[PDB]
UniProtKB/Swiss-Prot annotation:
This protein's record includes keyword Hydrolase: yes
GO molecular function: aspartic-type endopeptidase activity
Protein name: Endothiapepsin
Domain of life: Eukaryota
Residue span, Peptidase A1 domain: 17-328
Whole-protein coverage range: 90 to 419 of 419
Catalytic activity field: Hydrolysis of proteins with specificity similar to that of pepsin A, prefers hydrophobic residues at P1 and P1', but does not cleave 14-Ala-|-Leu-15 in the B chain of insulin or Z-Glu-Tyr. Clots milk
Cysteines paired by S-S bonds: C255-C290
Species for this entry: Cryphonectria parasitica (Chestnut blight fungus)
Keyword Signal appears in the UniProt entry: yes
Length: 330
């Protein structure tokens, strides 16, 4: 089997991407944030505290003839941005782009933190990291990809995120029309539960490539590119007037600037992020200070190849017995 679904930016900055997902019988379609940095499929629901729902579409398990309470199971997750959610668990039929999994754990939120409530466009998350990170207790549950894998034509999914435009998540096949050149594959460590890999270096604009190992994660659920402070300083030093602002929370730059590109290495191959992809717009409405799309990871503990980086590439998440990642230009 295969599946193919369009993913759409939630706003004009590409802060996140939403993908329609069919849950239950008859189908209830919710727009989920596909997150290769986590491993829980959770939704706003008829069980979510009413004051914490503000415009999201909810899953109502009582209206699904295939929903079953997973008795005794609870979940609770905290994300790198400080947001969180928790609740109980049903199993139900879940379909993405024509690919159907029966018995998928659908984690129903009883509580969500304010950032989720405040984002009316995201109805939940669909985790695509390794199932060892799934938070369901006392019986850990499998991701949608893990449940689908054996049925897929090939044990892979691909992320093709757009810049200021829709893109595609495919399951079970690699669309050879969706990229240019060849796909370069690179090793993955699953020891932390992430799609963790080592970039071979970077360049700023037309500058020379610096060969240096940068361990990080391919994370579709993180907006920006978070890299070591040395790398980030080298980038922003090429932008007149750019500075790190403790009050804003990262590097800012004059909105009048033209940003240089940023290149990252994948083995001997190179992915070029155009400068425009690094512009996240005014820090507040009407400001002439703009927020940068490349930020330091120093306070995170891990480097994160988020959407800024991934949207410059066609990305293969290869879930073979030994997982690997593939990157191609497009």
């Amino acid at each position: 089997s295969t599946g193919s679904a369009t993913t759409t930016p939630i706003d004009s900055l590409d802060d996140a991407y939403i993908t329609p997902v069919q849950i239950g019988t008859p189908a209830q379609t919710l727009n989920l944030d596909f997150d290769t940095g986590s491993s829980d499929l959770w939704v706003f629901s008829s069980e979510t505290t009413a004051s914490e729902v503000d415009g999201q579409t909810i899953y109502t398990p009582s209206k699904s003839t295939t929903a079953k309470l997973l008795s005794g199971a609870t979940w609770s997750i905290s994300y790198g941005d400080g947001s969180s959610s928790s609740g109980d668990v049903y199993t139900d039929t879940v379909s993405v782009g024509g690919l159907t999994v029966t018995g998928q754990a659908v984690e129903s939120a009883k509580k969500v933190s304010s950032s989720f409530t405040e984002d009316s466009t995201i109805d939940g998350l669909l985790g695509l990291a390794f199932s060892t990170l799934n938070t369901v207790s006392p019986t850990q549950q499998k991701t949608f990809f893990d449940n689908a894998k054996a049925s897929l034509d090939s044990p892979v999914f691909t992320a093709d995120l757009g810049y200021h435009a829709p893109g595609t998540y495919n399951f079970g096949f690699i669309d050879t029309t969706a990229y240019t050149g060849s796909i370069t594959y690179t090793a993955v460590s699953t020891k932390q539960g992430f799609w963790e890999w080592t970039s071979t270096g970077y360049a700023v604009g037309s500058g020379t490539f610096k060969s240096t190992s940068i361990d990080g994660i391919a994370d579709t659920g993180t907006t920006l590119l978070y890299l070591p402070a040395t790398v980030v300083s080298a980038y922003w030093a090429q932008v007149s007037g750019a500075k790190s602002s403790s009050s804003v929370g990262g590097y800012v730059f004059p909105c009048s600037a033209t940003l240089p590109s940023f290149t990252f290495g994948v083995g001997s191959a190179r992915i070029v992020i155009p400068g425009d992809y690094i512009d996240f717009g005014p820090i507040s409405t009407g400001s002439s200070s703009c927020f940068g799309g490349i930020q330091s990871s120093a306070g995170i503990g891990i480097n994160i190849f988020g959407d800024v980086a991934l949207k410059a590439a066609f990305v293969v998440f290869n879930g073979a017995t030994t997982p690997t990642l593939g990157f191609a230009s497009k």
